[PDB]
Structures are given as structure tokens and as C-alpha cells.
């Protein structure tokens, strides 16, 4: 793992529309800060309805019949995606640093893990461009029918900071692969990662106006991209709240297609037969990976009575072993949160549990002064009524209940309004298959966790989301399906 | 074609929940009327939040793990669907009559066409139950992944009267096939068709509480089924208005999955090389089939200059040849509309065009006294600014513009906020393929129209709809996709 | 289970070509016998090159463009298949009896199991007729491509007696579904089952000359159907020997497509953690189901040392519990073999093991006088060098080795030239997935056996077979794939 | 187009097994010659049963469980393929030259066309490695089934010279993608192209013993690779003769899977409405591309009476316009044939037609002295009885019949024992679809020809071939399908 000791510089801070770095009409530029240190990083600009509208207009152009981007052979879309990927891999070092300096994330995590993931989505999605096929339904009659999988149109993507670049990639890969044009709105907590990738797309040679990024504060662009009368798909990844907002506006605009992957409270279910060693390590990443800021974080470990206490032991034991240090520092297994917003919130949640008599086995507070560091916390004896068990503590905090039966645990996990993921640790074949099905989640993990690959479709059940991403199924959201039926004369089977 | 001279009787007028004919809590029962005669047919009941909630509760029961309906082998779901189909075909005669007496529709159309269609969806969907398969993604790592296509849960279906039974079937086929449980809310203009089919499902042996129908006025159940905190999918087929309503509530409830197939203004594009004979006949069904009450009605025929007038001639010529008579009378090619609502509206639209200087080549008014009969109308010299060219005249009325180029016509059709369907009549290979793609519709028809088969996916682009129906793609809306990843030891390709 | 005490009558004994019961040119009619009693059942006829050629000619007619069978909408092919299925289910009783009286098979097995299976293939395959679709490859260039899945042509099917009707159905379902025409050659040991089904197809209304059956001795028709210069696919299910014969002639005729599902020696691998109870019962059906005359019979159980002896105990224990009685007698769990051929052979194999020092724990000989009954036998301490462990003892005989490691057992099973199936009994998740993959078989069974459903593709690896059957993959053998590429003008994505 | 004036050097002339350049056991090395000049190019070695057996042994090693090549994540197989592709593109210039110097082919054709094609297969096939998925059949019962698409094993590929590198790529792409190991036997007329690519695979980092090339004379290795008792798939691309040979040995060895794409006589069908301009140009490439040495060459143009003569005119007109010059010379549109073998044969065929009274409108003989150059020939007034119309004149020679009806022409084309391809030139929609279906070919071309892309499956009907290549369907030949069924407890839909 190379280290970019080079003081990371922010090369891009402006809006990218028509492959050109515009500015803000109001001339208003918001400020980005290093949450690991609280210092300011730079002054990216802030978009508004004008810029969204501006870019959306760019999109329709890119998407028009006989455009450069529509007549381009699909294989060539794939060829271009592969280049962005290859370009991102070349600049990996820096791009990895710009995520840490702005997302506050262990570098080993934003290099050995994140940027690699981003490249691999674009690589996968590239090889899926020329393989999205139609059908030739053997209809009845002397007619000949065939479905065509065709691009939707302009796609608006609202991303969340947690994974500044991975989700951008998870959304401009399936999109650009199927042939759609994207207006990307990156988050406020972190605008740098994307703006930079936009420059690499331009080097890749993507046509002018295919991928338009409109960095800028939420409320504003949101309603816009999500109510333009020219955008057809709004894909939002963020918290449930903003989500009902985006979907509402969707109806109240054009019935545009809406795929939203909100979050959830996911349950781990270690069982008497589990290899506690394994369950302990993986239950650990589950809650303390990226400082619990992954929508798939195990904010609810249920351990069977038999092995409740033991689990508790190592669980907290390893918890304290995390290091609230510098994401830009080696050996650091935990970084800042992200901002006073989540930061204060996290602490508040920690407090609530305390009030609720949570078994605060560790942490409970913050570490250090400048920046935003919370102390790897743990709450034993959590009950299904504790707030810590009813909400997304999106942050480092571990809650751990106790169950005595299989039916009870699967019921006590499915008693939520969420279903992004789950972990059943077991050493039994029958349990594995029953608890994997009885659980209501989009992705269940048996004896592992956080294992998400591009190939595998990912999304959420219930109010955890809408649609899927990655996979072969994530290219179903960005392609409409035109049936054409011709009147041939005699139709022979 | 047999004729049910037998005075059609309304056997069912009450709510079907848990395979039992309940009543209305308020004891309020709405009245259904024969639009062909305006006489009342019977007194079906009217549901409310209580009954919706009642039935939704029935559903969750039906859908529970180890339920009778979930442990049932998929093949058996198919076996049961095939029986409903076979039962519907046995009772065809009557069931055909109950649609005419309540939908006001030519019997030849509700027998030789509609009921046949209804059976064939259920037959198709039945043979799709045991063939919805997952995958075994060759993921990276020594892990083994597989996607499972699993039932969503309780599905709420809001149907429109136009096709009282076909859409019920288009929605309880893909659903019941994939294993979901349905709470069906039929329309007010016509509750009889469905309630009856519900009885046939019970004879078919469908478990108790799988298919619950809650007949009842719109506003009420609507918000309910569409905001229950236990229904997961709301599929609505109706007008755009109610649609943004259902989707907005969706977000403002559970982010439940929402597939809505609203309507559209569809364009026919007869061209200089077309076989006017063919184009004339098919452009005729396009607008005057089921009294223009098909969301795919050609409310916009564009004829190239060369053959504008000629087309106009036969077009109107055949128009007058339609017969505003008795849907329950043989030889009648047109029946009542449906109710003063659409009836008055239709006439109003007719008037507006008159005010707009539409070339009222025929009709313009109503025919007969009792019931709701409009005179097959036609409006030549329509312009893209005439109201008749900007709205769904959902009723018998034909509008006919004139275009001089291919680019112009395809632009003047794609200049709408709709895209359910279209008809390009041509005798040229290149046109066919370009105009079929350049057009923005879910279903384009070349040299034919109204040709919709179950096998072929159907839905709408733009604000014409959301998702698809029928097809192999219509079983993509009712199945969620669970990825399970196991940690095997060594993984060999 | 109803019982057809009615003295089963053989209604059909002649050749079915053009939906008509022809005879034999030579006038030669072979004799069929009841192996349960050795009495003769009737005198079916014997075909020859003339009759094969005769029927093949019928086929080409049925398959010609604009034929009745080619212009028939696929849905209608499915509709017709469903009727044969429904007809077979109506006559189930008798048809079940005609298999027992001729195959010598426990009635409970030829009713509660076999005929049910036959119906379910035809039901499945029926619902697969209208869903075999092409694609619309997004090729490069301004061209438009689409693959059409089209019928091969006349298909020749050589069946084996063991499952007289199930394999006929496994071959005239995928075929008739995809639209091909079949010339079926049934076995000598048992011609009745099929000839009868042919009559039911005719009642079903299948066109005249679609399904032509040419009953008749092997050698003769074989080379014919398999070297006609008008048949395109020869699907043979039988022993390896005849198979290399059919394939060699294939090349030496027309390179016709050849899918052959020969047999194999399949290995069960019970392990220390297995539920011996379960493993014992299922390992039992594995070898003594249908008198070991199933190509998937466990002629090789490997038990780990730990639980070797115990397994041996119950294994033989239950073995003796089988009853060499009357297949047409209730309570009989084992019937005759099939004919002196296999009968003598079986006994010979039994003897060879004895010579090899097999641990003859039970049986070893025949039971009763008339007919062909062998005594449920068992051979402990079998070694990988014993003939009983190198050949298909296609008959009741159980061999049981002992293994001490996982690697060793999976190696000692994969050391064959076969791979139809296998059974890994385990209670461990990791073993299950590794031994299921490490094993070289088309169908591996974990903790069960003989579980074969229509939906699941079935065939053999290595010299155990060629291609697959059932499944969605079994409609890949009977459909060729025509790519058509048109030169459209501008091609927009 | 860069030109490798650099005297092309033959870097590789030896056998590649275990990523090492072995030699020949007999020490026998065959000689390769430049057919454009008849001079010798170098002295490649000649393999035998020993070397085949040698390499096959290497393969099994590469394919073993836990091998480096089997545990490799599929994505990584794709990553490696992409590198070979990228490496081939880097060396393009030379590799293009080594095909011309040895295949005798216009450089513009072996650069701007061939090497590009080779790279694009490997690029496509690479992106298909991680997307070959199984299924999760919703079987009946409380069982859980899933099909696994798994590598077959060692694959033996016999290539033909015509496209020395493209077919190597068409066979080591689908193979290496699905995970199989290949023993490639290149042709005698041309061994250089492949041996070189083998070096690039090694640079790509493909494991040691995955791709083993055994250059060497036909008869020898043939029977070997095709009868090794360790190779499972033999894919041969060549003439029909050798094909029945390879398939017969297949049965007479292991029933190994056999996909053979032999050749054919393909028919063009220009029609009265065709754009003769277009039909003329494309009918030209059809027969004179790569000197008629493409298995898809239009050795049978049928022109409707109306426009027979006209077609004849330009057809021959452009024919003479071809240039029998130097494939390594710019502006040369035709090169040598390949060797006295085809060369003498070609001339013989030309003579036969002369004897048959063919309307020798042009050519008829050879051009120049050294090398192997035939004069672009044409034969008008060909009849369906002329030898030139019953055999593959695999070489430059054009035959042109006359037809008066559609039915007649489609019958006169389908009256062959072949079906690789066809060209229907038309300007009518109905013809296009009927003649495209009525024709019996794997690939029909409407208004174009020779248009073959990787994405599109390609193979032959009838005795023109077996199986398909490219496409998503070409990864169905190299993957077997293991069904695993587990006994879960309760199975909920």
C-alpha cells in the first residue's frame, strides 16, 4: 500500500456540465472540511435549480437520437467505462487520499478496499454493456415480436457521503453501461471524490454532456433533479427521511422511476453452534467498519443464551482494540465520524441508551479534541425496546441482545421496518438455509459479513430500499423495455 | 358465440376476505348500474379502511412462513392458477355477460375477446410459477452465492373499470404465480366481474386468505391499501391523477414498491407507403375499440400529406359505420360509454374541439336517450395545439393531423408526457425499424394495432406508467431478490 | 391408490405413424412378457428400416413450413401438451398397470410415483412452449440482430425399458414443446406403455404425423432412426454400449445432433456426522429402488470408518426387509427384474463378487421360481478393485466401502468413467458445499437421494451422458438458434 | 494502418506446454511456406500422440481442484483474458503480418479486420467470465435446488488455417472464460499465428499449463486430442470430412462432447426489389473475401429473373476489379490461395464448371507464376445440377443462378446439406421476415453480408456444424451444469 504523503490537493471544486468545469450562478461556494481534524479542505461550489436545470439540459442533448452517445455501439460504451476504470486505478493513490481527507476514513480502507471496489464496479458494468439483450417472444399469431432493452433517459443520482466514490461508481456504471445519461448530485459532507472522478471520465473520452456532476447543498438540487420535467430516473442513496421526500416529489412531477436504497438496522444472529471466534471477528467488522457508517452495519447482534456472555466478552474486548486515531495514519483502525451532525447525533444515541440502562460495557464517549472521534462503544443487555434497538445509530456503537430459540430470534429481527442485510452465524446446514430464508433482508450473510461484491445484487427489502444495484439485476432499473410487434405473413415455429 | 339470454344475475356483491363473503362495517352498500340502459344492476357493498385493514390482516396470515400458501410448491401454485383459468372458461358465458351488463361492452368483445384474454393470462402466468429462477453468481472469493427470487408480501391492486376482469387477471396472475397474496380493490363503476371471479378462485381451492377482494368506493380503500403498514406492493391501473396520489402516499408510508400503469395519448403514424386499406381498418380499432376506453387508444393519427385526404375519407367513413346500439345486442359494434362521468366528459371534450375549430367530420354528439351513448366522432385538421391533441379523450372521438416528413412526425408524437403505445403503418423496412425505435412508447405496433398478447410485456414509458405487466418481465415486479452468500472452503470453477 | 384389478388389456401393439396404427411390413411381431410371472402379455409388432423410414417421412411432412404443426402458435403446442397430460392422468390407473405388468414394478411405484412424474413433465414442458425466447443482441454497427430459437426437425428417440413411460415423456415434452416432430422407438423389453400413450396423444388432437412411434426390436430401427438422412436429432437413453454405437453412426451419417444419457456407477458418501438414520433410509432407496434398475442407483456407498459398521448393520438390516413379491401385489416393495437378460446378468455379478471375496452380508441369490426375482443382496468390505465396484450391477445389489478421509472418498468416487449422480450425507455446511462441488456428477444430492424433479436439469458428466433433460436446459437441445442481422439505417441505443 | 515493413520474423516454432516451448519427440519439424510467394517461412515442429498426451497431462493438472486455475475467481479469469487481448493489440502490427505472410491475406484484411476481431472476442469473452450464472430452480418439496455452471475439463481445439488467429481466439475465449483448460492443435498450412499468441498468454500471466498448443500435422494429433481418455471436449473447425472423423472417434472413445463447425454452400438471394447497388457490392465480398476461403462464402447467388442480367453485369464487372497481387502489398484486394492443395483444387473446380458449360464470364485460370494466385472467376447460368452448385469451391469463384419466384428460390437454397449462412437482399418487410425464417441457416443476413460480430452466436445448421460460437450461447458448450439439491426443512416461497 503506497502512501500519498503528498499533501493532497483539491483539483476540482466546481460543477462539471458538458465536460467543462462551470461555477455557481449565485457564485455561492460551500466549504468542505477534514473531519479527522476539523480543518477546512477547500471551497467547492454550491449548485441550485439553475445548475441542475443547466445540466439536465446537457443530458437531453447527450441522449438524443443520432447523438454521439446514443449511436455509440454498446461495446464502445463498455470500452469507455473500462478506461475510466483504468484511469481511476492509475490515480488510485490520490483518489484514495481524497476520500480519507474528506470522508475521514482509514487509508487502508480507502485504498485496499474502497477504490478497488470502485474500479471493479466500473469494470463489471463495462462488460455488461454489450450483453443486455432483448427477447423474441414467440407470440401468438402470424406476428413477430421482440423486446428491446432501451435507455430510460437522463438519470439523477443523489449520493451519500459514507462511500463517496463507491456509490458514485455503483450508479454511473449501470447507467453509463445501459446507455443513460447522468446528472450526479454528490453530498455536502463530501464533494471532492466525485468531482475528481468527473475529470477522469473526460480523459476517458466520454462524450460531452453524458456525465454531469452538480455538486451543491442538498435541499436545493434535490427537489430539482428530482422534479425536473426532463429527468426520468432519480436514484437516491441516503437516509429514509430524504427518501420519502424524493419519491413523493417523483409522483408530484412525472411519475419518474424511483429507486431508493435507504438504510436499515441489520441483525446478526450468532448461534450456539457458531464458531464464536469467527462470529466475533465478523460481528466486529459488522458494527465498527467505517465507523458504523455503512447502511449494512450490525446494529443488533443477537446471541443465543448458551453463548451470550462469552460472546459479550470478546465482542467488547475487540471493541476497545479499535483505535480512534488518524484515518491518514497507519495502524489506525478507526477515524473521525464525519461531521458534528452525525457526530453529535452519535453521542446523543450513546446517551439515550445510557438513560435506558443499556449495559454500557465500553466507550460511551468521544476521544481526542479536534475532529470528530467517538469511542468504540458497546451496549450489552440491550432489549428490543431500547432506542438503540429501534433506530440507526449510524456510528460506532454495538448493541447485543440475548435469545433462547431460533423462532424467537428470527421473529425479533423481522420485527423492524427495514431489511438491507443480516448475518446468521451457524455451523448447521438446516439452520443456515431456514434462517437465511426466514430473515427478511435483501442480503443475508452466513458466517461472514460485509461481504458485498459487485456481481451480487444489493438493495433493501421493506423501507430499506427500492430496487437493486450491482448484479445483473441492477441493469434492470436503467433500461426500459420496448416491445415491437410486426405483422409477418406466415409464422413458422 | 353462445348468448346468455338468461337474465344475468349478480351472485356476488359482498367483500371476499378469508374465502368468505363478508359485508361492510358501515353497512354501506353502493349501487351499480347498467350504462347501456342506466338501470341499476344491484347493490354491491362499499368497503372502507376497516375492511381493507381487515383483509390486509388476512393476507399477512396467508403469507406467513409455513403457511399453507408459502410452503406450497410453486408447481402447485401453477396447478391452482390453471384451475381458476379452467373454471373461468367453464363459466365464460355468464362471466362474459356480467362484464357487458356492467361495463357496457359489445358481447362479441367480452366473449370472443375479453374473457379469452383473462383465461390466457392466468394460463400463462400459471406456467411461469415454477420457472422463476435465481442465479448462482460466480462471486469472487471462496464463497458461494446465489440469488433467490422470493415473494414480496401482500400486494394491493387498484383496478380500473374499462377492462373489469382482464386487469384483475393481469394482476392476480403474476402475483399468485410468484407467491404473493393479494388485496384487490375493484372499481366503482364496475364491481361485479371481480367479485364473481373471487368465487371461482375459492372453488379452485386457493388457500383461505390469499386473494381478498375489497369492493368499495375509491377514495376510501385507496389510501388504505396504499398506506397500510403491512402491504408492500401497490399496483394501480387507472388515470394519471390517482396515480401520483397513490405513489405519494407510498413514500409517505413505507416506500412500498409502486407499479402504476397510467394512461396516454398514443400516436398512429400512417405513411405514404402504407397500405391505406390496412391502416384504415386498424386505425379504426385503435380509436373506437371499447369506445376509446382503452389506454392504448389512437387519440392521434398522423397521416402524411400525400395521403392525408384519402385517409380522412375512409377513416370517417368507417367511423359512421359503427353502431351505437346495445352491447347486449348482436351486431352492435359500439355500446354505452360507462357513466355520466366519462359520458359528460366525453361530450365536453367533443365540444372543446368544436370551439377550437376542429374539423368535425362526423358525430359530435350523443345517440339515443337512456344509457350513455356518444356518436362515433371524428376531428380532421387537428393541430398539435388543439385540446383534443393534448388530453386523453378516453372515449369515442378521432383526431387526425397531417405531417410532411418522418422526422417531423416522430417529433410530434414524442412531444407528449406519455408513452403507452403507438402505430407506425409502413411498407418500408428501414422506416419500420427507425420509427419503431425513435418513438417513445412501451409498445409500438407496426402495421397493426391493439395487438397485445399476454406473453408480451406491456406498460408505459414516461408518465404513462411504471413497470410492466404480462411477459416474463411482469414477474419481476412481484419478486424480491435475496442474495445469500455462504463461506465455503475452497471454491473451484 | 386405486387398484386396477381389471385384468389389464393391451389395447395397442402396433406402429403409430400419421396418427394411425399401422403394422409391420415383414409382418413380424415380437412377443412381450410379464417378468413378474414370465407369462406372455401380448404380441406387439416389430419395426424395421422400412417402418422407421416410413415414419420419418411422416415427420418431415408434419415439420414442413406452413404445416399444421409449424404454424401452430406455441401457446397452442402447450395447450395440446397439457391435454395429453390431462388425458394420461385420467387413464392413470390403467396406464399405471400396463407399466407394472410389463416392467415388473411395484404398483405403488408406478402410480404414486411414475405416472405422476410422467404427467408433471408434460405439464412442465407445456408451460415452457411459449417462453423459449430469442435475444436481440446489441450488435456493433447500424445493424439489428436477433436470435431465433427454432425447431431442429425430426427427432429420433431411443428409450430404455426401466422407466417405460417417464423417459418417453421426458423426451416428447421438451420436443413437442419446442416444436420438433418425434419418431419414438420404444424398447423391446417393454413396448406397451408408449404405444398406449400414443393413442392418448391422438385424442389430444396432436396433428397427424407429429408423434410417430415405431415399436420394434433394437438393432434394426436403431441404426435407421440414427442414420436416416432426414432425422436431425437422435436422443438415446440406454446403456453406454449402444450409445457409442448411436453416436458413431451419427457422424457416419449427418453429424446429426446427439444427446445420449447413458448410465453410471454413483457414489453415496455417508460421513461421520451424518444422521445415520437418514443416511440409512435414503441409501436404501438409492440401491433398491426399482430393483436397482435406475441409472442413478447407489452402487457404491462409502461410509467413514467411524460409522462403517453401524451403517453396515442397518443397511443390510433394511435390505432383507425388502420383499421379492408381486409388483401387482400390495405391500410388495420389490418386483421381478425385467428379463433373463438382466436377470441372469444380475446373478452373475452377484457371483463375481462372491468370487472376489465380497462380504456377502445378505441375499446372493434369486427368490421364487417363475418370473425373475433376485434376493435383495448386500456386499460389505467392497474394495475399489472389486468388479462390483467397477461396473453397473444394474439390479438389486448393494456394495459398501470404507473411507477414512474426505479427500480420499471424493477421490475414490471421482475415479470412475461416469457421473450421473451422487449422495453426500452430511450435517456440516462446509462439507456439503465442497463435496458437492468436488464430486463429478451431474446431480449430487445432499442428505437425500433419488430426488429428481422435472424442473431440475438432469444428465450425466463424463461417459455418463451427453446434454441434459428436463429443466430449462433441456429445451436447449431441441432448439437451434438462427441469428438474423438486418441492415437498419441509424442504430440508436 | 501501420505497415510492418520489418521482415517478419518467426519467433515461435515449437510446442507450448506448461508455458514452456518444448520440441518434438521425434524431432520432426514441418515446414511452413509463404503462399503469396511459395518461399518457405520457417521450420515449425510437428507434434504427435506423445506431445498431445504430454500436453493433455498438463491440462488435467491445471484443471485440478485447488489448482491455481480453478480456485481463481472468475473475474480474474476475465482480468487475464483482457490482458491477452490488450497484449495482442499492442503487438497487433507483427501479429497481423504473421498471418499475411503465412495465410496469404491482404494486410488491410489482417489488420483492419482480423486482428481487431481476435481482440474483440477475447475482450467480449472476458466480460462473460463472471456472468455465467446458475439458477435456483424452485423445485417441489422442502428441498432447495440450484444449478451450477461448471467447467467441463480439458478442451481440445482443432483449428483451420483460413482464419489462423480468429478461430483460435473464438475457442480460447469461451473456454478460458468458463474455466476450462485448452490443448490447441493449429493447422499445418499455418502454425505461426497461434504459437505466437501462446507467448502473449504467458506474458499475460495465465497459469502454467492452461493453454497448451501442440502444433503438428493433422492426422496425428487429431486422433489423439480427439481420443485421449482425458480430454472431454473436442471442438473442431474445418471441413466436413475431418469432422465426421472427429465425431466418430468421439463416440469410440469417451462420448466426449463434440462441437464441430464444418462448412457450407451459402445462398445469396437478391430480389427484384433489392438495391442492386447494395446487393452487388455485398454479394461481392460474399464470394471474394479472403479468396472465398470463408466458410460463409456466397457460393450461390440466386437473382430474380427481372434483374438477372443486370446483376450479372456488375457482379462480374466488380469481379475483374479484384487484384491478384501481394497480400503484403497495399492496394491488393486479393492474395494467394493457400497451398497447392486448395490451389490445385480450386483450379480443378473451375475446370469442372467449364466442362459443365458454366457461363464462364471471367477468370477461369490462375494469375502470375510463383505462389498460388487464381483469377477472380465468375460462372453465370449456373444450374442447381452444376458441380459448382453442389460443392464448396472454397476459393475465388462465383456462381450465379436465376429464379422467378420466392418459393422456388427458398426451396432451391434449402435443398442442400448445409446451413452456415445466407443473404437475402430485399427492400420489403414481409419478404425479409419470411425468407429469413424459411431459410435454413444459422446466420441469415438481410441486405448485408459477412457481418459477423462476436456478440452474435454463430454456427451451422444441418451438416454445416454443431453447436454455436461467440454469443452468450457459445458459453453453453464449455460449461456443464451440476444440479445440487439439499434437503432443507420448511421451504417457503
Residue numbers in the entry:
A (entry chain D), B (entry chain C), C (entry chain A), D (entry chain B): 9 to 501
What does the paper say about this structure?
Here we report the use of “Build and Retrieve” to define the composition of a raw human brain microsomal lysate. From this sample, we simultaneously identify and solve cryo-EM structures of five different brain enzymes whose functions affect neurotransmitter recycling, iron metabolism, glycolysis, axonal development, energy homeostasis, and retinoic acid biosynthesis. These enzymes were identified as glutamine synthetase (GS), ferritin (FT), dihydropyrimidinase-related protein 2 (DPYSL2), glyceraldehyde 3-phosphate dehydrogenase (GAPDH), and retinaldehyde dehydrogenase 1 (ALDH1A1).
The ALDH1A1 enzyme plays a primary role in the biosynthesis of retinoic acid, an important signaling molecule that specifically interacts with the retinoic acid receptor. ALDH1A1 assembles as a tetramer in oligomerization. Presumably, residues I166, P168, W169, K193, E196, Q197, P227, F244, A231, S234, V250, S247, C303, Q350, K353, E400, and F402 are engaged in NAD+ binding. The catalytic site of ALDH1A1 is surrounded by residues L114, S121, K128, T129, W178, I304, V459, V460, S461, and A462.
